[PDB]
Amino acid sequence: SGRPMDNEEWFPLKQTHYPPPTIPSMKTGHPTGPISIGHIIPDLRHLDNVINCKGFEPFPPNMDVFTAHYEQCHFGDHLNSEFVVQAGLHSDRWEYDSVVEYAVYPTRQYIDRLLESKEVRQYIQASAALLGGWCVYMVTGIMVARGGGTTDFVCAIRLVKIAKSGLRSSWTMKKVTR
Amino acid sequence: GRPMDNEEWFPLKQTHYPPPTIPSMKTGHPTGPISIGHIIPDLRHLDNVINCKGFEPFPPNMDVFTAHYEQCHFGDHLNSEFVVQAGLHHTNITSDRWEYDSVVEYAVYPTRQYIDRLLESKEVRQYIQASAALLGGWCVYMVTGIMVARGGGRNVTSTDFVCAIRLVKIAKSGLRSSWTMKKVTRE
Amino acid sequence: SGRPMDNEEWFPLKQTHYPPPTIPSMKTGHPTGPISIGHIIPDLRHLDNVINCKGFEPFPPNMDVFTAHYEQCHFGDHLNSEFVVQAGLHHTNITSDRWEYDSVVEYAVYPTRQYIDRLLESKEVRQYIQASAALLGGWCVYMVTGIMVARGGGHTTDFVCAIRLVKIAKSGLRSSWTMKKVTR
Amino acid sequence: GRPMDNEEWFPLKQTHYPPPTIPSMKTGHPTGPISIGHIIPDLRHLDNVINCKGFEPFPPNMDVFTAHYEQCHFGDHLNSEFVVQAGLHHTNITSDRWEYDSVVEYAVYPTRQYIDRLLESKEVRQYIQASAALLGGWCVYMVTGIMVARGGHTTDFVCAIRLVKIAKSGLRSSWTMKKVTR
Amino acid sequence: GRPMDNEEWFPLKQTHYPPPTIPSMKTGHPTGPISIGHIIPDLRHLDNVINCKGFEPFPPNMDVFTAHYEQCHFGDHLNSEFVVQAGLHHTNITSDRWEYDSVVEYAVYPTRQYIDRLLESKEVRQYIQASAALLGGWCVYMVTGIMVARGTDFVCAIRLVKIAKSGLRSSWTMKKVTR
Amino acid sequence: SGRPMDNEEWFPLKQTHYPPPTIPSMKTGHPTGPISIGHIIPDLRHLDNVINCKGFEPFPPNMDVFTAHYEQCHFGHLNSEFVVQAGLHHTNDRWEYDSVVEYAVYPTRQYIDRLLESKEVRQYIQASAALLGGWCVYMVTGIMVARGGGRNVTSETKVNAHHTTDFVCAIRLVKIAKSGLRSSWTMKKVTR
Amino acid sequence: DNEEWFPLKQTHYPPPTIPSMKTGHPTGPISIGHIIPDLRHLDNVINCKGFEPFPPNMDVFTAHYEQCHFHLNSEFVVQDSVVEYAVYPTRQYIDRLLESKEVRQYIQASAALLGGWCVYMVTGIMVARGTDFVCAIRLVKIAKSGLRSSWTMKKVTR
Amino acid sequence: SGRPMDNEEWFPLKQTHYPPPTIPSMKTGHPTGPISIGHIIPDLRHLDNVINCKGFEPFPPNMDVFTAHYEQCHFGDHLNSEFVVQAGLHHTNDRWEYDSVVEYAVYPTRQYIDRLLESKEVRQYIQASAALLGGWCVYMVTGIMVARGGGRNVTSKTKVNAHHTTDFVCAIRLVKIAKSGLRSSWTMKKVTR
Amino acid sequence: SGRPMDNEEWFPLKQTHYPPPTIPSMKTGHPTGPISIGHIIPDLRHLDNVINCKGFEPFPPNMDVFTAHYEQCHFGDHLNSEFVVQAGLHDRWEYDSVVEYAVYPTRQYIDRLLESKEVRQYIQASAALLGGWCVYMVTGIMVARGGGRNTTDFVCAIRLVKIAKSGLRSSWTMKKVTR
Amino acid sequence: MDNEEWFPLKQTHYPPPTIPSMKTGHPTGPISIGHIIPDLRHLDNVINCKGFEPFPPNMDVFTAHYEQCHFGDHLNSEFVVQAGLHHTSVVEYAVYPTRQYIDRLLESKEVRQYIQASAALLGGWCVYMVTGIMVARGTDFVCAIRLVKIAKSGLRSSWTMKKVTR
């Protein structure tokens, strides 16, 4: 199965097998699946919880969804049998047959518009008033697994961190790793 | 629980400051002496409000947010008394006199547009111009939060009252012609 | 009542029962408990996978264990019900638990570079460090610098409710590991 | 006149602390509750002296220096009240209540050797060890100056102090010292 | 009450120059020879005004602020007691206490626009262009405040700011001057 | 299959050309192959030119060779999917293996110093310091061996060729350099 | 700038006509103004369907060379008429090159699927006499990564 | 003769080879001399290679020629008799003296530089240097020293070797205008020996 | 004549007032003059107030004095600037032979001069009362052999170096002084 | 570009030092690797003309034989026309200096005397060490030199070594 899919850029969704959204519904801002590109989540410990669950802005023409197909994939890389024995430390790998990555590169304009939707704006304002600043994570990619080892499901997500603290005026976006 | 920015809350020693009504806190004319939006000259004169006659009402992107705490204290300091026993050095982390019950936090996050509206108000503009002439620049503090403790019970000193405030520091210095805002922590 | 001054640095153990080590065993480098000051864990997704589980270097004789007594401790997040309502996130299940424990006792030490160097030399820790350094870029471990113990019922019923850790990392091939406190 | 570092002088609101005798300041056993060489935990507790039972006597290179002021106040505030007249905007700069007369300032500049000797004192070492264990670092303030008001055993009293912030953080293995203002 | 920026007031000494009338200050033609808005070339001679023939009037929004002090001390830190304890009693370094009674302070806040207008007078511009061509750059000092002691009243101290464009920076910088 | 083996840290070699070394000879300092961990190369243009060809220093105790095993691997970017959505259409082959083993070491300061203090490494370093500005060499930090060989595959999937003998398919390097008259050298991971 | 010219595969690239280099439609396969994805290709022109013409401020300058054979020579191991055509890339011309239909698709595909994008611009060509052929290219690295919102332009040397 | 006129900011030229320009011709943009204020030279070694040989923009009224007169002057590098003996060396080093030396100086504005950098010859040289080489670098003559009444060549005792009683330029003060790494804008730095 | 001697590197004193020290006494640590190389002054506005007037440490063997002779020297600028500048309209000193004596200080010698009794007392008083300390070391002296305005020798200028430690630096910084 | 690192000798025609004499610290030629010159204006005013420290075992000399190595400025007849302006066998020996060797050089009698004099009269001191020589065939003669700038100016108490390029 080569190298595992759970890279440092991809957080695996292992709580519940959420079904994927249709490809056109991702660009329209009203996805059919509960987890899609363009969704804002509060923190890394609530990957399922979506702030803009009612809908978000449709993808502008400078934001097309790109694909990457992989076959005979597995999910491990977390203290494998070989790494444990040669590190002195002391998991059943799942084998999927078709895994597709859907990815998008966000523009600052699209983020500026997303930070103005009612739900995201309210969360940001509450976090700014009660806490120091605010911090949200945008789903920039989704990994959907077809088949198992039956229905397709979003198996991973790729995020970007948008933040504004220290009373600064401009928000900053940064890639997240694990 | 306790507020995440608890170090940024300055307690007001006097329990004689009545709170403003919830509706008047955003109209620009709070019914109390200390409220969100008041401008003070410095951390020594927290009782002197410069815009005591009224200020700019809160814009829609600047709403008041609430939190409730059964108990609230401002400052946990380590005592100098230490007892050694059972091979352990026992410390004593105590709370200060500024401890109140049933405290409600009202909080706000200011925008640059709103603060710019504040710096053009008559009283604040007068103070800013006078300070810039007499000193290098000017420095004021805007109340960004208040805490109201219930009156009576264990909140009695020898009927609700403002027990603590949270401030932002607004300052323009060095002829920058551009003011900066910074969080203020109790040190 | 007084409360921890580093309460943002205490990670709760949640609904478990890790027995607290006896204090004499703690300093000996062989605590009677599963998690204790001086234990090395590989990451923050475990908090119980101690690498030096067979023991570690004893405490230096000049290194002392300090104790605090809190009437109550709260180790939960800010995503309470009121914040949920005022953030508009009432539509999703996001509220976490309040980890409010009563009659808590804190045991804390101050790590020294020499003692950490000695902790990194046990057969288990140097094995995880060398393997992580060769197969991956660098290595990163976390040392337990403090433990909170909640009181049980009317002892052996007491249990560890929270731990305070420190990140010990070297990834730039700079031949010098760096130490930093961990938060949230 | 006024001291050049007048901003660094915290006034003691309580006017009942008698000053130490001049010979006792440099012996490490001052006859007064607050004096040069004392270590306080933080800026909120000036009455709380850690090295209360005594500290290191001053080395010969740490002599006490004096200054005299007919009037010393700590805080000149700009009032919000203004009057426009004759084309001028009249302001009122008023002194803070902390205003004393016939003030003698005793000042010291400490060396790293003397401070390292202070940090090894029983009480101070115990406090900083506890703080390091409970906080990953420690922070103490050494009073490097006092001001005695001879107007308003002796009848004089300590009216203000001047401190230095001694701190070690992040296990930097070397403490730093800084001046404190306000 | 005492001046809050007391270290920024350079004392004029035996130069008992008369104070300008307040109406004459704002007009750019003060009746006094040392006034707010005057430009001097250096700190060695505080009465060598280059705009001696007049300058740009104050902007209508630029106001003059006034502070009355019972006493003012502009003396150096080299007072007698410091000189004694530093072991410099065998020399003449002891400075005088410039203590004046019943002092009035007139102060303004300079803006970049008004300073640009002060740099465009014939005398100041000629000092700037020649100092920048013959020497590296230029450096002038603008009087931002004056202190006046009661008598006939006279100016006892001035507050200045340093305006300097050096190193071919294409923009001058403004720094508060202390002593 | 799965995610490809050509990480940015793993530079691929000429397929079916470099035989693997014996496992015991990697630590001896005299490896039985043309390329292995511990070798010094002048740059990335000559992945085969070895400076320490006449043996190098044996591995110290703190240098153990760790292994990582992978199954159903492949190499390779210029795939048909990325090319068609990038709009290039530049005729885009791909190698597949049954088993791939990564052998990895972490270099220490003292062992690098002893490698720079070598008979053959000093000549390349000193001559480069005199004639050229400074010196810059690369050290093999890891190797990838296709245990069981591999196969050349092209998709429109066709197995073009079959190779059943072991060979090294990639190396992982670190750049060791000294320039600007600096006293101490520097080491940095090499990415692609 | 001897360390800024990457050689290519010999006798494989007919040189374009000098007037064609400035009209944005060069007659040769490799020319000034072409965008290549990596340093491993040096032949995969992205803007193969043309690019923006050289602005008036950009002019092609020439350096002839009677240079013969003359990094690791035989001595270092022990111890042909050519012409250079070069330009200077202004930032506006780069901003317009990145707006080409071919260059924008590679960038958006690289940014979404990877972290960012890195492209190279042929700032100079080096054509030797024989039939003549382009023997070397001098490139410039144009890159925007880390969500910088402003691309950087640097020179490349081996 | 006081301090030498060879300050670190004044590069000396070959004596009696460069005639001075007339006072009015300096600000007209067409100097009557071979070297004058406003000339752009390529390097510190090619003084005669004036790029803007045809002419340059006349001096705007914002830029005036300021003068400085000196009397009984002399030239001398650091390797004089007194320095060499106490520097351990023994190879001492002709001295030029002048009765009157006049400095003419100006301060260049960024706009005047932009209008000089957009002239034909300067633009051609700059574009050639930016395309063929990494970047471009030009030097502008910000000042000139002329020896009114000429001077005398002297060797050391002191012996006069020649008398040249004709006015000539003896030193120039330059400034470095350079752009590299595609800074999108030029920088100006005073040059010093 | 020529370029003036009082450039930005040399500070002029009161002419015909300060006698030179005998050349042998400049390296013995006890100069026979009031102002010499090795003396420490408190401020730039009190150039003759020598702090270590009771002698200092003799020059170590790696600190030799170097000389520079000049003939037909003058001090000051003329009115050619005041005209091209438009300065206020509100006469120079000439000498036949002017000798500069110069020394490059070492960190050890400065650390030992900072431990001299008088310098130590001044520094301790300044640190305890003012917050920091700052002194200037005479690193060169310019001496005129006979004077004349438009007989006996005298020191006409000094070249100084600022040695300072502010805000608890624990180490002193040494920088050149310009004017 | 290594060509920019080399500076020309104007009508000197000095004899090249014998290959062994370069390491011995007493080269037979007047200009050699390891010589100290005061500035770029005086490229043949060797300060350490009485000899210098012999090349340590790590400082071996390395040779480079060029048929016709390129030495010149940017001004070439090809470059002159396109800018509008008006027209107007060799072997290299090189070494790489170490910090300790330069520290020893600065303690030579002649070098230290020039350093202490420059530091006292001027602000700091600045010297140049010949790191390479370039000799063409005849009698043969050194035609170019490659130097490095050594300077502790600025009261830093820490000398820096930079590379000089024309």
- SS3 for chain C is CCCCCCHHHEEECCCCCECCCCHHHHHCCCCCCCCCCCCEECCCCCCCCCCCCCCCCCCCCCCCCEEEEEEEEECCCCCCHHHHHHHCHHHCCCCCCCCEEEEEEEEECCCCHHHHHHHCCCHHHHHHHHHHHHHCCCEEEEEEEEEEEECCCCCCCCEEEEEEEEEEEECCCCCCCEEEECCC
**Cα–Cα dist H184/H79, whole Å:** 42
Identify the bridge partners of residue I154 per DSSP, sorted by sequence position: I144
Q: Is D96 near chain E, with CB under 8 Å?
A: no
Per DSSP bridges, beta strands I93-102 and I133-145 are: antiparallel
Phi, psi of F69 (to 5 degrees): -105, 140
Please tell me what DSSP assigns to residue G112: H
DSSP class per residue in chain I: --B-S--TT-EE--TTTSPPPPGGGGSSS--SSSS-TT-EES-TT-TT--S-TT--PPPPTT---EEEEEEEEEES--HHHHHHHT------EEEEEEEEEE----HHHHHHHTTSHHHHHHHHHHHHHHSSEEEEEEEEEEEEESEEE---EEEEEEEEEEEEE-SS-SS-EEEE---
- Identify all chain A residues contacting C83, using CB atoms and an 8 Å cutoff: 126, 130
Residue bearing tokens 């243009």: F45
HEC secondary structure over chain H: CEECCCCCCCEECCCCCCCCCCHHHHHCCCCCCCCCCCCEECCCCCCCCCCCCCCCCCCCCCCCCEEEEEEEEECCCCCCHHHHHHCCCCCCCCEEEEEEEEEEECCCCHHHHHHHHCCHHHHHHHHHHHHHCCCEEEEEEEEEEEEEEEEEEEECCCEEEEEECCCEEEEEEEEEEEECCCCCCCEEEECCC
**Cα–Cα dist F79/F93, whole Å:** 9
Please tell me what DSSP assigns to residue B57: P
Q: Find, among I129, I127, B173, D7, the residue nearest to E2 by Cα.
A: D7
Distances (CA, A) of H57 to A49, H63, H113, H122, J15: 68, 12, 10, 12, 51
Distances (CA, A) of A157 to A12, C30, F3, F16: 6, 42, 16, 38
Largest Cα separation within chain G, whole Å, is 51
Helix (H, G, I), strand (E, B) or coil at F142: strand
Residue bearing tokens 């995880």: C128
- Identify all chain G residues contacting A104, using CB atoms and an 8 Å cutoff: 112
Q: Is E129 near chain H, with CB under 8 Å?
A: yes
Report CA dihedral (F94, F95, F101, F104) to the nearest 10 degrees: -50
Distances (CA, A) of G71 to F123, F128, F139, G2, G74: 16, 11, 19, 11, 10
- Identify all chain I residues contacting D147, using CB atoms and an 8 Å cutoff: none
Distances (CA, A) of E32 to E36, E47, G111, J43: 10, 11, 69, 63
Tokens for B100, please give them.
């109140």
Partner-chain contact A3 F1, CB within 8 Å: no
**Cα–Cα dist B119/B141, whole Å:** 11
**Cα–Cα dist A147/B27, whole Å:** 59
**Cα–Cα dist B158/C3, whole Å:** 26
Cβ atoms of residues F27 and F66 within 8 Å? no
**Cα–Cα dist D176/D178, whole Å:** 7
F-G interface (Cβ pairs under 8 Å ≥ 3): yes
Provide the CA C152 distance to its chain's centre, in angstroms.
20
Distance from CA of H165 to the nearest CA of E (A): 27
Cβ atoms of residues C60 and C35 within 8 Å? no
Residue G74: its H or E element: helix G74-78
Residue type, G30: I
User: What is the Cα Rg of chain A in Å?
Assistant: 18
Per DSSP bridges, beta strands B39-40 and B180-183 are: unpaired
Please tell me what DSSP assigns to residue E43: S
**Cα–Cα dist E138/I68, whole Å:** 31
Identify the bridge partners of residue J142 per DSSP, sorted by sequence position: J135
Residue type, B107: A
Angle separating helix axes B122-134 and B112-119, nearest 10 degrees: 80
Residue B44: how many other CB atoms lie within 10 Å: 13
> Terminus-to-terminus CA distance in chain E, angstroms?
21
Length, in residues, of chain C:
184
Residue D179: its H or E element: strand D176-179
Residue F135: its H or E element: strand F135-146
Q: Find, among C124, D125, C98, G44, the residue nearest to B82 by Cα.
A: D125
**Cα–Cα dist E175/E161, whole Å:** 6
**Cα–Cα dist E85/D63, whole Å:** 10
Q: Find, among A97, A102, A76, A95, the residue nearest to A20 by Cα.
A: A102
Q: Where are the beta strands (DSSP E) in chain A?
A: 11-12, 40-41, 66-75, 94-103, 134-146, 153-164, 172-175
- Identify all chain I residues contacting J155, using CB atoms and an 8 Å cutoff: 161, 174-176
Helix (H, G, I), strand (E, B) or coil at D116: helix
> Terminus-to-terminus CA distance in chain G, angstroms?
11
Angle separating helix axes F119-131 and F109-116, nearest 10 degrees: 80
Phi, psi of J121 (to 5 degrees): -75, -45
Cβ atoms of residues C67 and B89 within 8 Å? yes
What are the start-end ranges of the H helices in chain D?
A: 22-25, 112-119, 122-135
Largest Cα separation within chain F, whole Å, is 55
Please name the chains neighbouring H, where neighbouring means 3+ C-beta pairs under 8 angstroms.
Answer: E, G, I, J
Least CA distance to A168: which residue of chain B? B181
Q: Find, among C5, C10, C57, C1, the residue nearest to C182 by Cα.
A: C10
Phi, psi of F51 (to 5 degrees): -80, -50
| Residues contacting residue E178 through CB under 8 Å, at least 6 positions apart | E7, E8
Question: Quick one: CA dihedral B84, B90, B95, B96, positive or negative?
Answer: positive
Identify the bridge partners of residue F162 per DSSP, sorted by sequence position: F151
| Residues contacting residue C159 through CB under 8 Å, at least 6 positions apart | C16, C17, C18, C19, C20, C149, C150, C152
Identify the bridge partners of residue E141 per DSSP, sorted by sequence position: E40, E162
Residue F159: how many other CB atoms lie within 10 Å: 10
D-G interface (Cβ pairs under 8 Å ≥ 3): no
Question: Quick one: CA dihedral B74, B80, B85, B87, positive or negative?
Answer: positive
Please name the chains neighbouring J, where neighbouring means 3+ C-beta pairs under 8 angstroms.
Answer: F, G, H, I
Tokens for E83, please give them.
């000189």
Angle separating helix axes D122-135 and D112-119, nearest 10 degrees: 80
Distance from CA of I174 to the nearest CA of D (A): 21
Partner-chain contact C137 F189, CB within 8 Å: yes
**Cα–Cα dist J22/H107, whole Å:** 50
Q: Is E14 near chain D, with CB under 8 Å?
A: no
Distance from CA of H85 to the nearest CA of J (A): 10
Per DSSP bridges, beta strands B88-90 and C66-74 are: parallel
**Cα–Cα dist A158/A160, whole Å:** 7
Identify the bridge partners of residue G126 per DSSP, sorted by sequence position: G84, G136
Cβ atoms of residues D83 and D90 within 8 Å? yes
Tokens for B187, please give them.
């040190």
Q: Which of E23, E68, E81 sits opposite D66 (nearest CB)?
A: E81
Partner-chain contact E176 B129, CB within 8 Å: no
Provide the CA A177 distance to its chain's centre, in angstroms.
11
Please tell me what DSSP assigns to residue F34: S
Partner-chain contact D135 C5, CB within 8 Å: yes
Q: Which of A42, A88, A130 sits opposite C127 (nearest CB)?
A: A88
Partner-chain contact C86 B65, CB within 8 Å: yes
Cβ atoms of residues C159 and C150 within 8 Å? yes
Tokens for A47, please give them.
């990957």
**Cα–Cα dist H152/H150, whole Å:** 7
Conformation bin of residue A20: beta by default, left when phi > 0, alpha when psi is -120 to 50: beta
Q: Find, among F11, F78, F18, the residue nearest to F44 by Cα.
A: F11
Residue E121: how many other CB atoms lie within 10 Å: 20
Residue type, I16: T
Picking from B73, B93, B99, B100 by the largest number of C CB atoms within 10 A of its own CB, the best residue to mutate is: B93
Q: Where are the beta strands (DSSP E) in F16-61?
A: 40-41
Cβ atoms of residues B58 and B64 within 8 Å? yes
Domain boundaries, chain B: 6-183
Question: Quick one: CA dihedral H78, H79, H81, H87, positive or negative?
Answer: positive
Least CA distance to E147: which residue of chain B? B134
Tokens for B59, please give them.
């814009």
| Residues contacting residue G14 through CB under 8 Å, at least 6 positions apart | G27, G28, G29, G131, G132, G133, G134
Cβ atoms of residues F138 and F125 within 8 Å? no
Cβ atoms of residues J15 and J32 within 8 Å? no
Cβ atoms of residues I34 and I18 within 8 Å? yes
| Residues contacting residue H76 through CB under 8 Å, at least 6 positions apart | H4, H6, H95
Picking from F131, F132, F135, F178 by the largest number of J CB atoms within 10 A of its own CB, the best residue to mutate is: F131
Provide the CA G156 distance to its chain's centre, in angstroms.
10
What are the start-end ranges of the H helices in B4-138?
A: 112-119, 122-134
Q: Find, among H177, F178, F133, the residue nearest to J162 by Cα.
A: F133
Residue A33: how many other CB atoms lie within 10 Å: 18
Cβ atoms of residues F138 and F184 within 8 Å? no
**Cα–Cα dist H47/H44, whole Å:** 7
Residue E68: its H or E element: strand E64-73
Partner-chain contact I85 E48, CB within 8 Å: no
Which approach determined this entry? Answer: X-ray
**Cα–Cα dist I172/I132, whole Å:** 11
**Cα–Cα dist A55/A72, whole Å:** 34
Q: Which of C134, C173, C175 sits opposite F104 (nearest CB)?
A: C134
Conformation bin of residue I99: beta by default, left when phi > 0, alpha when psi is -120 to 50: beta
Q: CA-based angle G105:G106:G108, to the nearest 5?
A: 65
Cβ atoms of residues I148 and I9 within 8 Å? no
| Residues contacting residue F183 through CB under 8 Å, at least 6 positions apart | J99
Provide the CA G122 distance to its chain's centre, in angstroms.
1
Cβ atoms of residues G40 and G9 within 8 Å? no
**Cα–Cα dist A66/E59, whole Å:** 60
Identify the bridge partners of residue J149 per DSSP, sorted by sequence position: J128, J162
Per DSSP bridges, beta strands E64-73 and D88-91 are: parallel
Q: Find, among I148, I150, I48, the residue nearest to I91 by Cα.
A: I150
**Cα–Cα dist A142/A156, whole Å:** 6
Q: CA-based angle D171:D173:D175, to the nearest 5?
A: 100
| Residues contacting residue I37 through CB under 8 Å, at least 6 positions apart | I26, I31, I65, I101, I102, I103, I138, I139, I140, I141
Helix (H, G, I), strand (E, B) or coil at D119: helix
Phi, psi of I80 (to 5 degrees): -65, -25
Q: Is J161 near chain F, with CB under 8 Å?
A: yes
Partner-chain contact I64 J116, CB within 8 Å: yes
DSSP class per residue in chain J: -GGGGEEE--S--PPPPPHHHHHTT--SSSS-TT-EES-TT-TT--S-TT--PPPPTT---EEEEESS-----S--HHHHHHHTPPP--EEEEE----HHHHHHHTTSHHHHHHHHHHHHHSSS-EEEEEEEEEEE----EEEEEEEEEEE-TTTTS--EEEE---
Length, in residues, of chain H:
193
